[PDB]
Structure 1
Amino acid sequence: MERVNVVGAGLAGSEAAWTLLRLGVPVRLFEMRPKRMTPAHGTDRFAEIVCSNSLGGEGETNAKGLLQAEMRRAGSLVMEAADLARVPAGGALAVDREEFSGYITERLTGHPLLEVVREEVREIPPGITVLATGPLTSEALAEALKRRFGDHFLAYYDAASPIVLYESIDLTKCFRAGRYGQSADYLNCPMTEEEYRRFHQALLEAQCVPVEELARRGYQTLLFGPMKPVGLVDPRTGKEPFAVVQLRQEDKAGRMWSLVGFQTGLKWPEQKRLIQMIPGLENAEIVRYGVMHRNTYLNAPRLLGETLEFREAEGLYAAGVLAGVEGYLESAATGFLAGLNAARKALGLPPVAPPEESMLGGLVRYLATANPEGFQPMYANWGLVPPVEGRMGKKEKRQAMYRRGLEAFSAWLSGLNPPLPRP
Structure 2
Amino acid sequence: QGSFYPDPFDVIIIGGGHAGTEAAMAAARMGQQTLLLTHNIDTLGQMSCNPAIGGIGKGHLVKEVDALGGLMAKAIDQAGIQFRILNASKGPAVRATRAQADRVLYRQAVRTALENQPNLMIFQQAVEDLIVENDRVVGAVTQMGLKFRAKAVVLTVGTFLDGKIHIGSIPLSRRLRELPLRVGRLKTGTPPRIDARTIDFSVLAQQHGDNPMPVFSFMGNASQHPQQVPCYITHTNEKTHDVIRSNLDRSPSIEDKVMRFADRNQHQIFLEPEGLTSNEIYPNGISTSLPFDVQMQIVRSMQGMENAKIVRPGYAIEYDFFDPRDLKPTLESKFIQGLFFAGQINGTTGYEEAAAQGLLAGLNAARLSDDKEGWAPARSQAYLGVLVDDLCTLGTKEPYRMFTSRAEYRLMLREDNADLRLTEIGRELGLVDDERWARFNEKLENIERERQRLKSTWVTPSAEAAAEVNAHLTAPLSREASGEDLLRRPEMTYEKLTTLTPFAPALTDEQAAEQVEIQVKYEG
* Contact 1:319–1:335 (8 Å) recurs in 2: yes
Q: What secondary structure, in the 3-state scheme, does the structure 2 residue paired with 1:119 have? A: coil
Q: Which residue is equivalent to 2:70?
A: 76
The structural deviation recorded for 1:90 is: 4.0
* Contact 1:70–1:410 (8 Å) recurs in 2: no
Q: Which residue is equivalent to 2:391?
A: 367
In 1: Cα distance, 2:332 partner to 2:392 partner: 10
Is 1:143 aligned with 2:173? yes
Q: Which has the larger radius of gyration?
A: 2
Report the AA paired with residue 298 of structure 1.
F
Q: Which residue is equivalent to 1:248?
A: none
Structure 1 stretch displaced more, 12-21 or 98-107: 98-107
In 1: Cα distance, 2:431 partner to 2:353 partner: 20
Instruction: Note the 1:156-171 alignment, pairs <5 A.
Output: 157-158=186-187
* Contact 1:135–1:295 (8 Å) recurs in 2: no
In 2: Cα distance, 1:159 partner to 1:328 partner: 13
Instruction: Note the 1:10-409 alignment, pairs <5 A.
Output: 10-33=17-40, 44-57=42-55, 62-88=56-82, 90-91=84-85, 92-125=98-131, 126-127=137-138, 128-134=152-158, 136=160, 140=170, 143-150=173-180, 152-155=182-185, 157-158=186-187, 207=244, 265-266=253-254, 269-270=257-258, 273=261, 293-357=316-380, 358-370=382-394, 378=397, 381=400, 383=402, 387=406, 401=411, 403-404=413-414, 407=417
The structural deviation recorded for 1:355 is: 2.4
Distance change >3 Å, CA 120–CA 337, structure 1 → 2: same
The structural deviation recorded for 1:340 is: 0.9
In 1: Cα distance, 2:404 partner to 2:376 partner: 14
The structural deviation recorded for 1:334 is: 1.0
* Contact 2:13–2:154 (8 Å) recurs in 1: yes
* Contact 1:135–1:322 (8 Å) recurs in 2: no
Q: Which whole-Å deviations, capped at 9, do the CAs of 1:248-303 have from their partners, x for residues lacking one?
A: xxxxxxxxxxxxxxx974367537637xx9xxxxxxxxxxxx99942434333442
Q: What secondary structure, in the 3-state scheme, does the structure 2 residue paired with 1:320 have? A: coil
Structure 1 stretch displaced more, 103-112 or 295-304: 295-304
- 1:6 paired residue among 13, 21, 44: 13
Distance change >3 Å, CA 294–CA 314, structure 1 → 2: same
Distance change >3 Å, CA 405–CA 149, structure 1 → 2: farther
* Runs of 5+ consecutive residues of structure 1 not aligned to the other structure: 35-43, 161-203, 218-262, 278-289, 372-376, 390-396
In 2: Cα distance, 1:63 partner to 1:27 partner: 30
In 1: Cα distance, 2:383 partner to 2:106 partner: 23
In 1: Cα distance, 2:128 partner to 2:109 partner: 28
Q: What secondary structure, in the 3-state scheme, does the structure 2 residue paired with 1:321 have? A: coil
Report the AA paired with residue 119 of structure 1.
Q
Distance change >3 Å, CA 21–CA 271, structure 1 → 2: farther
In 1: Cα distance, 2:114 partner to 2:159 partner: 22
Identity %: 25
In 2: Cα distance, 1:135 partner to 1:141 partner: 19
Distance change >3 Å, CA 303–CA 297, structure 1 → 2: farther
* Contact 2:188–2:317 (8 Å) recurs in 1: no
In 1: Cα distance, 2:348 partner to 2:248 partner: 31
Distance change >3 Å, CA 386–CA 116, structure 1 → 2: same
In 1: Cα distance, 2:60 partner to 2:403 partner: 12
* Runs of 5+ consecutive residues of structure 2 not aligned to the other structure: 1-7, 86-97, 132-136, 139-151, 163-168, 190-240, 266-286, 290-315, 437-524
The structural deviation recorded for 1:30 is: 0.7
In 2: Cα distance, 1:144 partner to 1:298 partner: 13
Is 1:419 aligned with 2:425? no
User: Over aligned residue pairs, what C-alpha RMSD do you find?
Assistant: 4.1
Higher relative contact order at CA 8 Å, sep ≥6: structure 1 or structure 2?
1
* Contact 1:48–1:97 (8 Å) recurs in 2: yes
The structural deviation recorded for 1:14 is: 0.9
Count matched residues.
295
Distance change >3 Å, CA 307–CA 413, structure 1 → 2: farther
In 2: Cα distance, 1:297 partner to 1:328 partner: 18
The structural deviation recorded for 1:149 is: 2.8
Q: What secondary structure, in the 3-state scheme, does the structure 1 residue paired with 2:357 have? A: helix
